[PDB]
Amino acid sequence: SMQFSKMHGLGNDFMVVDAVTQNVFFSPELIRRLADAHLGVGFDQLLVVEPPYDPELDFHYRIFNADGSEVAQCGNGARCFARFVRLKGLTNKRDIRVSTANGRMVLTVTDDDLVRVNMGEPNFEPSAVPFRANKAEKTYIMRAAEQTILCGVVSMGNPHCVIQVDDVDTAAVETLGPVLESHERFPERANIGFMQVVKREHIRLRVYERGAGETQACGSGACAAVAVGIQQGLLAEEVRVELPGGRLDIAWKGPGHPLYMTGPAVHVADGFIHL
Amino acid sequence: SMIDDDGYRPNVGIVICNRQGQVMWARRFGQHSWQFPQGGINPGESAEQAMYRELFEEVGLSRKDVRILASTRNWLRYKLPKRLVRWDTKPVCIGQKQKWFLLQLVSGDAEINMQTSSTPEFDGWRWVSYWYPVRQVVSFKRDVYRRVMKEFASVVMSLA
Numbered sequence: 001s002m003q004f005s006k007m008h009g010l011g012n013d014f015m016v017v018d019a020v021t022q023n024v025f026f027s028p029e030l031i032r033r034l035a036d037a038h039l040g041v042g043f044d045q046l047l048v049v050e051p052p053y054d055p056e057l058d059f060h061y062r063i064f065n066a067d068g069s070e071v072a073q074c075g076n077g078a079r080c081f082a083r084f085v086r087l088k089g090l091t092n093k094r095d096i097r098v099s100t101a102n103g104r105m106v107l108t109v110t111d112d113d114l115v116r117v118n119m120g121e122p123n124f125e126p127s128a129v130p131f132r133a134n135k136a137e138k139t140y141i142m143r144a145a146e147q148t149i150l151c152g153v154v155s156m157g158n159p160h161c162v163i164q165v166d167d168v169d170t171a172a173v174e175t176l177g178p179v180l181e182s183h184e185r186f187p188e189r190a191n192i193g194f195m196q197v198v199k200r201e202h203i204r205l206r207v208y209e210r211g212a213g214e215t216q217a218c219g220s221g222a223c224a225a226v227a228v229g230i231q232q233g234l235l236a237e238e239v240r241v242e243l244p245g246g247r248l249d250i251a252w253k254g255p256g257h258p259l260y261m262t263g264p265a266v267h268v269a270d271g272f273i274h275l
Numbered sequence: 276s277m278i279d280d281d282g283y284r285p286n287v288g289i290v291i292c293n294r295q296g297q298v299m300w301a302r303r304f305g306q307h308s309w310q311f312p313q314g315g316i317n318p319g320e321s322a323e324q325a326m327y328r329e330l331f332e333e334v335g336l337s338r339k340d341v342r343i344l345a346s347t348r349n350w351l352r353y354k355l356p357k358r359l360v361r362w363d364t365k366p367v368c369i370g371q372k373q374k375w376f377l378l379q380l381v382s383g384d385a386e387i388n389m390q391t392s393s394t395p396e397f398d399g400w401r402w403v404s405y406w407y408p409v410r411q412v413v414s415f416k417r418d419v420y421r422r423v424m425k426e427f428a429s430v431v432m433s434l435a
């Protein structure tokens with residue numbers, strides 16, 4: 001009986017498997033069988049915890065989708081991994097060093113059982129977003145269709161354009177999102193975020209992702225909207241962010257420092273399945 | 276010989292941890308492969324006596340250099356891959372049967388010496404993360420290693 005847990009993070013449902021103390025090989029055929037909600041377990045994504053490849057790291061973990069393919073999205077599933085290895089007694093560390101398909105990270109489990117990720121230092125140089133603009137500013141003007149708007153632009157690995165709305169339920173997400181996502185001044189498109197500032201330390205936000213549109217949880221967008229609000233002088237050094245998928249908490253001391261993202265992971269169930 | 280009637284030679288294995296939760300990883304002499312120290316039990320000695328003997332001769336550590344934290348209750352067995360069984364040597368040994376010890380290195384790293392023996396089975400060592408040996412051990416020992424490191428995890432995790 002192979003044991004597993006179901007967990008939830010970033011509005012995403014994970015099947016999580018300890019393949020450190022269990023001998024399991026995840027062929028694509030087994031993965032698709034496990035993704036079947038009636039023959040197997042059913043999951044959005046499968047998180048497999050493995051022994052490390054490097055003697056200096058604690059674990060390696062992989063993420064597979066329902067088709068049986070390995071998925072390499074940076075930071076994906078990090079919060080549920082860190083809590084899972086602690087919940088299951090695979091480690092007692094609070095700073096867990098782990099390798100993924102996108103490299104290695106150091107994950108910190110805070111004493112409130114939240115997981116903090118170092119997302120690096122945001123980059124506002126329009127050359128590296130990439131953005132058609134002569135030099136970096138705290139705000140840019142862009143004529144979008146029959147409407148002139150203001151925005152900040154930053155890259156966190158991926159391009160981001162953030163604009164301030166005064167409520168996100170009253171936001172023109174479906175009419176405005178696509179127009180600036182594929183705007184001529186974004187040669188590689190960009191994730192557009194609609195940021196309703198409730199307080200210098202509190203924000204609501206919806207995000208029109210680059211290729212997908214509105215996902216209920218996009219971590220890089222929350223990082224971007226807080227990075228710009230700080231650089232624009234509108235926000236405190238530590239901001240709460242509320243998205244349709246849940247709440248994140250960003251922290252960043254400004255240029256020269258790395259930005260930190262902290263989020264929850266919910267342990268919803270444990271289970272058995274005979275393979 | 277000590278080979279039982281199944282073909283398993285009695286054996287002792289050693290997991291040496293430091294106060295940071297790392298475990299000692301040893302390279303076999305004149306080879307590429309790494310492993311935990313292990314050795315055969317000799318006639319007349321118990322498992323613990325064979326452990327202390329193999330500990331000193333292969334790692335150079337005394338009884339006072341370490342502390343016993345745990346040991347596996349019964350035998351763990353692995354079969355040699357039939358490529359490696361010396362069939363002409365009787366009684367034929369088709370595998371090893373092991374009792375495992377978890378030690379905490381009480382002294383400093385400078386008390387390890389892998390050359391106290393004329394016939395060293397190991398020529399090097401390093402600290403590795405706790406679960407690293409489960410991936411890196413040779414394949415036919417992996418099931419034993421996974422069971423051992425799983426049994427010992429709670430003891431090591433409940434230190435600092």
Ligand SMILES: Nc1nc2c(ncn2[C@@H]2O[C@H](COP(=O)(O)OP(=O)(O)OP(=O)(O)O)[C@@H](O)[C@H]2O)c(=O)[nH]1
Nearest residue numbers: 286287308309310313314315355359371396412413
């Ligand atoms: N690649 C690789 N080969 C190994 C390893 N361990 C043993 N072998 C080979 O397998 C043979 C016997 O394996 P073992 O069961 O480990 O025998 P042993 O370690 O010499 O016996 P003891 O140290 O006395 O317990 C050796 O002669 C090696 O050539 C290993 O960890 N990796």
Ligand SMILES: [Cl-]
Nearest residue numbers: 336337338339
């Ligand atoms: Cl002694």
Ligand SMILES: [F-]
Nearest residue numbers: 313314315396
């Ligand atoms: F030996």
Ligand SMILES: [Mg+2]
Nearest residue numbers: 312313314396
């Ligand atoms: Mg030996």
Ligand SMILES: [Mg+2]
Nearest residue numbers: 313314315316
């Ligand atoms: Mg021997």
Ligand SMILES: [Mg+2]
Nearest residue numbers: 313314333396
């Ligand atoms: Mg020996």
Ligand SMILES: [Mg+2]
Nearest residue numbers: 314315316329
């Ligand atoms: Mg011996």
